Amino acid sequence: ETHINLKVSDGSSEIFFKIKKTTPLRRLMEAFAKRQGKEMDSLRFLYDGIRIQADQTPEDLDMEDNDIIEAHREQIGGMKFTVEREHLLKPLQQVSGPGRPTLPILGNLLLQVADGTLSLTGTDLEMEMVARVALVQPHEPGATTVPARKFFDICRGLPEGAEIAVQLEGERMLVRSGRSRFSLSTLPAADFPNLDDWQSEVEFTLPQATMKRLIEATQFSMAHQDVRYYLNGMLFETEGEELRTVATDGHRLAVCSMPIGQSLPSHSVIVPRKGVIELMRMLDDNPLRVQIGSNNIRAHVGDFIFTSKLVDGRFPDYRRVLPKNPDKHLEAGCDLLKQAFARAAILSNEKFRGVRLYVSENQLKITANNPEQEEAEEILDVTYSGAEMEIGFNVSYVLDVLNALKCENVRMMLTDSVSSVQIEDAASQSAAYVVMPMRL
């Protein structure tokens, strides 16, 4: 695994080379030009459209076995394409999701034209989004980077049905449509960062709606800027035939498990908060293919590919957080409970948000008081036959759970006044929520 096999092709002639991963590609380029009877200057060597510099090595470019170097007749800043606005709008919106004065290139999109395809890539150094757009019209291979927001806004601002022609002029990118002309500043494609390749460890396909359910069921329970950096993300776990997400901030936990119809090795990784956000943005036809490595995750959706670094830490075991014997079960309509908590919350303490629950035979009383000595009281019919108890909660955490349960009836599983409560859909164990009480 010290050397690399490479194919160099000019569209008719193909020459193969074995070189050390640490050897500069200069000798390879000059030898190919020599076989063609052409001058070294008369050709440009493109790797996925990006111009290779003679001092770069395969290792520098993360090349892999049987990668292809395309020799093209010299064309300084040669990238050129013409595409329908409608074919660019969603790709541009998607990749512009993931920008400092010291890192201007991170506010740019990488554009690559190669093999009949326009690729657009956005990155923030820790995640990247790539879109592929088929080029139906004539084009010329090459690459550049261009300010993402300005390019998107220009394309969006052009009229419905416009064709957008793009080419390079010195250090600018010229965009033309109708009698509209725009010249944007560029930075070299060779300077755009790219995550090095990695090995997928577990791989599975699942419907977009299933992944969306898993994230929406738990996303609200993630920590915000917790020093326990692992809590700011979402645990993604494979076990048996299920995929599971877990989120917690130390006061509440959410766990959701869904079947994915294929038994898998057990694997457990932490996806960062911004990665969870980007994953959700992609879940707009076809299903979703997920690859999970030891330090990275990748999601393939249609003609998009999202990759994110993982959070390197030890996520808590939700199994240890679930109440051990929550033997007092209350069931109530979800909407009726939510509306009662929402009204009681109006007169709770604005900072601590405590409300008090009194459970008795088939009845729940919710009360709230604030420093002004205002008081709310709500009485509901519920199903409950356990011992009477009084337990306090942060009403925001309770409302967060009830809003995430999109169901007819909920079950609250109680132990005592100082122990966590487990809340689930009365009809489904797919998701579970655990909320610590406040002391009274």
Binding site: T248, G250, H251, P316, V321, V434, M436
Partner: peptide
């Protein structure tokens, strides 16, 4: 304001 039994941190 007690926490869930997270190890560490509670």
């Amino acid at each position: 304001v007690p926490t869930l039994p997270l190890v560490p941190x509670g």
